[PDB]
Symmetry: D4
Subunit: 153 residues, 8 copies
């Protein structure tokens, strides 16, 4: 909405644990107006939720695999059911319908190659797909849930 909302969101995306009175002080605001701004943004759905982010090394999901899918020609309903069943897998953490050479791109997290192999077998039992090409990440250099706020309007 305005520049003060942006200052609030910039901190909230980094850390939602601050007492609302300490966030207020960090953004140059009294407590009530700060709280009221946050409430409006929650109601409007700008802030969609607040979550704990876990360490993938510590919950044993340290490998990222990017799975590239090509589909055959299919009805709007088949695509709706294909994307519902891929979405149910807890290991599929991101799922995109792409343009370009590939139809869908998934990001999958698992502890190791063998865990990936067994995930893939469960996936492929439930769907049918012309071509799957999996690519394993060697390192996660950056992963953030912070959006760029320079474009807000």
């Amino acid at each position: 909405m305005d520049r003060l909302d942006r200052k609030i969101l910039r901190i909230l995306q980094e850390d939602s644990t601050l007492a609302v009175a300490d966030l207020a002080k960090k953004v140059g605001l009294s407590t009530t107006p700060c709280w009221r701004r946050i409430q409006k943004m929650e109601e409007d759905g700008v802030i969609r939720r607040r979550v704990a982010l876990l360490d993938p090394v510590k919950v044993n999901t340290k490998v990222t695999v990017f799975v590239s899918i090509r589909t055959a020609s299919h009805s709007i309903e088949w695509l709706k059911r294909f994307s519902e069943v891929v979405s149910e897998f807890p290991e599929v953490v991101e799922f995109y319908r792409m343009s370009g050479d590939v139809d869908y791109l998934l990001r999958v997290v698992v502890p190791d190659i063998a865990a990936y192999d067994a995930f893939y077998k469960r996936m492929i039992a439930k769907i049918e797909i012309r071509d799957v090409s999996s690519a394993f990440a060697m390192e996660q250099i950056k992963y953030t849930t912070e959006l760029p706020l320079d474009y807000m309007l």
Copy 2:
């Protein structure tokens, strides 16, 4: 650590706003032991942080671009500086060193093609790269920050 820690984490990854006494009740625990478990997991870094997640449509970052990079042969220090300068861009929300045909995979968020074009010009002024191939997402079907907890050990 144990199965009760998993029940706690499963809720925390979905919603970190609950009062600790209400989370306790949802996991079958008294309040203090629940709190003490959460504290241990924070100290140990299993829980790395708690954050607000924003709606990309509402902060004007609705387009996702997957940028595939190939590099020339370079020193361990060049790769260290290349990955530091790509990491600074607020639009680069995910950044992986890959195995396979592509050296690096970025996920970039922007409002539109023109915003992507201008991001790309800023990136390429700061780095040098044999080949960049960008692919635009048509739809984000799933995006979650919840890790699968079935592998915890």
Copy 3:
């Protein structure tokens, strides 16, 4: 036909608004012979039509997408109907049957990625196609309707 016809066409391809008497003077001709040359070229179909060209930024069609299609094996009649239904789309501004890896190449104009996504859904409801690979233009550096006239014979 001859070199004076070429001088006439070179101007007409740039600007068809000139009074025929001013075009005559610009090509070194009296008015009637100039007019008579233009008439012959219209009758013969060398000049096929005269049109207004609009600014794509101002009519909200600023994104160009090049859509690469591969088809299955099909009858001469299926190809005739496939190309008739793709041709009806007002967004398909150019459409070629190609040689090489790709069977067909389309140029599509739309305001944005979302408009492209919805165009693609309408297209794909009406046709069936093994593989579509879309590539978005970052910039239109040159677009002219002027043909090279150095080869005329």
Copy 4:
């Protein structure tokens, strides 16, 4: 601007030869208001120009080649000069800076393969380019200079 402007433009893109009084009647308007609308659209640059379109078979430019270019890493000024020198070629009728695997896409028109070969030699004397991949069209199924007007706003 409004729906009557759209009706005017829809005809103008098809045929700019009509007397303004006959266009008026076709769009449900008196002559002066029709003329005044057209003038505004010219002044504003919505209508950028009016041109004769020629028959490529009759001016001996019947072959279309789509030329895909990849460049090395280069300064913003090199790209500015590269695109100025490619733009000067009368055979390069369309020229795009692309996203995806290819850096630039050209559409080139010539009478035959040999004319293409000689064009290519002239181009490559003047520029330096990692990779050029040319693809010849077998047929031009549709070519229009009419933009879709459904998106106007």
Copy 5:
């Protein structure tokens, strides 16, 4: 067979018009032994035939197209009939069953792109093929019917 046979063949592959007595002198042989060597090589089929070679520019077949074919899975009999019907086309001057990404490679000669287009339509009416990718030669730098004779044994 021996080194004198090789000297004979080296000339015969270049020019079969010489009187047998002049070939004899050029290879250091009397006429009868030279003739008798040539006869043996014809009978044994080392020399398979003698032919006129024509100038492709002068018989209006100046364009070479290399056609890469991929087939579906098929019976040994389907492949036998597919290769018999492709072989009948007078424009298919060379035809290979390949290893690697492509199943078959053809060399086709025609006067121009349009002649190629019409050849392709006739071919594809008679066969069914997953993928055809045609590539046009810009120049024939070397074409010889002379085999290397350094390996003879």
Copy 6:
């Protein structure tokens, strides 16, 4: 030139061994006019030469390899010298400057993979080339030196 010349050429491309009097009878001509037609076609270079064609299995050159080359950017003189040195190799029986993904296509004949390996080492000592991709033929289904004569004009 005319249809009788075509009848003559159709036989000559198959077999140049016939006495001119027997060819005459096969084409419906007296001997002298037949001879005179053949002479004209030789003088004009329509018939470029007459050669013995040998059996590749019998001269120990039974393997065909198609070698795909990509070059860097180079002067018109470098390309002239590159193509002169590749042309000298007796194993390079066909050599084309291509359009498309590949810059040059060679057809190479050798007895076996090891002979190919040693040819490749000699070639690469003498030239420098970004990318060579070799593909081995499994079978030569058709190889003819007969051009299609349906296009003659």
Copy 7:
């Protein structure tokens, strides 16, 4: 198991012909404890077998071909039978289910291209496969059956 087991295995992987008393001396052990360690490793299956390794040049299997296979979508049982029938071929010396663009990778040994061609025909009679791409090795630079022992644990 421990570092002395590693010293034993490092020699055994190189040469299993030594009398157990000479191996003992080479690893710093008395004979019985050395023997007892070897027995334990056989019983546990760390040592799976001892074999003669033959020279491929001397048994006429000097060509290596890497065969890349893509399959259609198939049941867990079809994949089980496909992999059983490919496994029976004595020429298929290594066989992997891959991730990435290719579904399976085989290493095949034969004397020559023709032997490969005939192997391929036998394979393809028994299985059905969307795409096979074969690549021939020019040289075997290293081939060892020794595993790296630095990771043992």
Copy 8:
């Protein structure tokens, strides 16, 4: 050499542990002639060595990676040193100079993705390579050191 040598080798490739007297009985031979045949084959190098084969799961090298390398143009000596330094790595168990799109193919064994990542860093410190594309095996379906003996001659 002969069919009895083949019977001996067929067993030796499977199991070299048999007492020579028991192998003799299995091949239909008295002991001395069997021994003498084996000695000849060792002296001639048909049998190159006898080795223990270990279980990759039990020595913690359970992941196979196929590493595809492309090199720049280089001297015969650079290629000699490149292949010597890649050969020294104990994890590179197979190493081939290839024909086709890829210059070299390696088979690498490691316990996991992280071990592969660290191997790759050591390799790339010691060599310079245009392009490396790694592909991870999901399963080793067959791995044998037995050559096909049907081609022996």
